């Protein structure tokens, strides 16, 4: 007895992407540079030949959150879906002028771990964005206001 549709892997990825798009109705919330990738993932399923996908699904996610000094900033999350997912977790790389080379590094290294533990062997790209907005803000360190006002 045949179950579901062949090449479930391809459908496992596309499905999510299609959903995310909705999760972010905003105009400047999520932007995908490598659109062709998706197209191949949609056709590969129909043709059921799994012979085309030559580029990885690259798409950045802009999330507006606060870090410090009652200020806000944009957080770019370069998410990349490999040809294994859910097999192997994506290569989500968070970047933001706010975070420095050192910090940013540690941050990312963590963002990945989160899933490796919580989300392992499944299609959950959101679970991450949620773990970031929380940690991210923390990582960002801004000190432009000291205590003890001086008069005169």
Curated annotation (Swiss-Prot):
RWD domain residues: 15-139
Tissue specificity note: Ubiquitous.
Cleavable signal peptide: none
Protein name stated in the entry: RWD domain-containing protein 2B
Species for this entry: Homo sapiens (Human)
Parent sequence residues shown: 34 to 172 of 319
């Amino acid at each position: 007895g045949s179950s579901g549709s062949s090449g479930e892997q391809a459908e496992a990825q596309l499905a999510e992407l299609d959903l995310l798009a909705s999760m972010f109705p905003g105009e400047n919330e999520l932007i995908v540079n490598d659109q062709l990738a998706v197209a191949e993932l949609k056709d590969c399923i129909e043709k059921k030949t799994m012979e085309g996908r030559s580029s990885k699904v690259y798409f950045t996610i802009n999330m507006n959150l606060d870090v410090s000094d009652e200020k806000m900033a944009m957080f770019s999350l370069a998410c990349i879906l490999p040809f294994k997912y859910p097999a192997v977790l994506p290569e989500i790389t968070v970047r933001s002028v706010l975070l420095s080379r050192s910090q940013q590094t540690q941050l990312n290294t963590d963002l990945t771990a989160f899933l490796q533990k919580h989300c392992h062997g499944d299609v959950c790209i959101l679970n991450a964005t949620e773990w970031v907005r929380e940690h991210a803000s923390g990582y960002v360190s801004r000190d432009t206001s000291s205590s003890g006002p001086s008069s005169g």
